[PDB]
Curated annotation (Swiss-Prot), chains A, B:
Ways its activity is controlled: Inhibited by pyridone-containing alpha-ketoamides compounds 13a and 13b. In turn, alpha-ketoamide 13b (tert-butyl (1-((S)-1-(((S)-4-(benzylamino)-3,4-dioxo-1-((S)-2-oxopyrrolidin-3-yl)butan-2-yl)amino)-3-cyclopropyl-1-oxopropan-2-yl)-2-oxo-1,2-dihydropyridin-3-yl)carbamate) inhibits SARS-CoV-2 replication in human lung cells. Inhibited ex vivo by michael acceptor inhibitor N3. Inhibited ex vivo by compound 11a and 11b.
The protein, known as: 3C-like proteinase nsp5
Gene source species: Severe acute respiratory syndrome coronavirus 2
Cytoplasmic side: 1-306
Residues forming the catalytic site: 41 (for 3cl-pro activity), 145 (for 3cl-pro activity)
Peptidase C30 domain: residues covered: 1-306
Subunit annotation: 3CL-PRO exists as monomer and homodimer. Only the homodimer shows catalytic activity. Interacts with host FBXO22; this interaction promotes the proteasomal degradation of nsp5.
Phenotype for residue 205 to V: In strain: Zeta/P.2
Reactions that this protein is recorded to catalyse: TSAVLQ-|-SGFRK-NH2 and SGVTFQ-|-GKFKK the two peptides corresponding to the two self-cleavage sites of the SARS 3C-like proteinase are the two most reactive peptide substrates. The enzyme exhibits a strong preference for substrates containing Gln at P1 position and Leu at P2 position
Length: 306, 306
């Protein structure tokens, strides 16, 4: 028993991280086959970041202006291109540690592990969620750029996130591996509105099912509700509306615990309307929404990788 | 900026995990050089676990009764010995992925990353602390045994924990890599008292310094206190007493933030006496004690490994 905010084992991603240097700028790159992927703002100076014309900047750069280092050894860059907000550096050697991999663009609410790196070396690994407003609440310092978020499935790594930017409000924004930002954000040192964040209702419900599985169930109430009635309460407390899809996805946890989804919704309703009243759920004094139903099933059944 | 419960990159430990089978029992082993380390209760049946004579049980076993599997390949066991509560299986092949490593016995309050494994394959990685009462609040299912906790320093892995047991109260207990349990616990299916847990005061203080570094500082009060006066309040709320050692260890965070330790103690005092009043600190509605001062400095300065 027990429930932790568990990250994927990082080993497969560790072997892909490299350092990319251009001018005075250094950040992390992801080396897969004979391509290195990194944020295109590697080509910028602090001055350029105010208002970069990335086309104009990249034109000044040649293959040899990109130093890629994997440990001690230099990779030779024989080609470069800009796809959206990422730079693709073709190198002459294939990464011998390349895992089976996909690029995926995940939906709001989904979760992944971040491998936080500096100078192409990992510092740590943590689990986080793509917020409804397409930001993440990560842990990123100067030089963290190029760090990636990912999911593993048996032996296949699914890369979903590359870190590009901390907003003025201290929250984090980035792209998929095709370099398309999550959300409205641009790679420019400018004030940028993230917009209203919302709580990921289905994830909270998943986490409540986790709590019941692990014996924590004081919050189970005598009430039920409807999807509409619940949603009225959801909008008030800045929760995402609950669909039959979300209800369907919770089916397994409902089947394992014998608690109907709408009964758990009623319990959740009461927690929102009355607060948690000084008590805790799975060591938390607030409603956690960083666990997808899939995360709960993974953790509580001990699914393995490699 | 931002602050996460970050685990170490697990890659170096992934390459050490193996499956150990004896009779019908299977659990995780740690393969370092030509030795595999695993819990000695691998030799038990469900019946034996009530009251095992480990000496008597092990005597019935020979080298060939231990199947060690690293992926597809079998390791050949050419020797076995019992050190305290761990079994050491000498194998004929050295692990080619052996990292630079130490065995350390950590103190209460210190932190480490757990790599949760099943059948010698990792499921996930999370950060936790050795509770003052020598338990850990982990995430462990049947078959999780042999899973290890560790710290990394540049390229050296320091193994501090091997998982052996979930207590009836759903908390977790284990040994160092020399097989000596943390705390009073024995490897027997019996009711076992963990004793009163306490909050790791120095870690809470560290985390408050982290909070100030990351702009969260509403909790900063107008008051100061003494070490004695603070400690009086500490004992009341089940906090560990604060020593000059702990004050000394917080020095760096005090120097970075310009907040004297005893002023932060006063702030902490007020949070304990008045509660958090519906507000949050670094996304938490309670006082986190799983971050050592070293963890805070690591995270907030982006220290790397490999
Ligand atoms: C990447 O290495 C670095 C990571 C930042 C630095 C502080 N924490 C992080 O997560 N990114 C940048 O250098 C980045 C460049 C963007 C504009 C492409 N700049 C920012 O992340 C950044 C920092 C502070 C304030 C603002 C405001 C607007 C845009 N970007 C900002
Ligand atoms: C290891 O694979 C397994 C992990 C346990 C199983 C449930 N979650 C875990 O963390 N350990 C055991 O099989 C273990 C054997 C001990 C006695 C050496 N038994 C327990 O961990 C266990 C489970 C429930 C209740 C009790 C009560 C007393 C002792 N051990 C218990």
């Amino acid at each position: 028993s027990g429930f932790r905010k568990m990250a994927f084992p990082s080993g497969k991603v560790e072997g892909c991280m490299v350092q990319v240097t251009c001018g005075t700028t250094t950040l992390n790159g992801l080396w897969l086959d004979d391509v290195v992927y990194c944020p295109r703002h590697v080509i910028c100076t602090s001055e350029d970041m105010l208002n970069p014309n990335y086309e104009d900047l990249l034109i000044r750069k040649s293959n040899h202006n990109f130093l890629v280092q994997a440990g001690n050894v230099q990779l030779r860059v024989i080609g470069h291109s800009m796809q959206n907000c990422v730079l693709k550096l073709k190198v002459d050697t294939a990464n011998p540690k390349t895992p089976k991999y996909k690029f995926v663009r995940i939906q709001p609410g989904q979760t992944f592990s971040v491998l936080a790196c500096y100078n192409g070396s990992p510092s740590g690994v943590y689990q986080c969620a793509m917020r409804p407003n397409f930001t993440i609440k990560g842990s990123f310092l100067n030089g963290s750029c190029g760090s990636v978020g990912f999911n593993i499935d048996y032996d296949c790594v699914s890369f979903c996130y590359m870190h590009h930017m901390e907003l003025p409000t201290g929250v984090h924004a980035g792209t998929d591996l095709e370099g398309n930002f999550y959300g409205p954000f641009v790679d420019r040192q400018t004030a940028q509105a993230a917009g209203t964040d919302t709580t990921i209702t289905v994830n909270v419900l998943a986490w409540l099912y986790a709590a019941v599985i692990n014996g924590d169930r004081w919050f189970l109430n005598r009430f039920t509700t409807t999807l509409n009635d619940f949603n009225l309460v959801a909008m008030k407390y800045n929760y995402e509306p609950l669909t039959q899809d979300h209800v369907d996805i919770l089916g397994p946890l409902s089947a394992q615990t014998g608690i109907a989804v709408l009964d758990m919704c009623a319990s959740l309703k009461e927690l929102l309307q009355n607060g948690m009243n000084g008590r805790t759920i799975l060591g938390s004094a607030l409603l956690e929404d960083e666990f997808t139903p899939f995360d709960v099933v993974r953790q509580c059944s001990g699914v393995t990788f490699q």
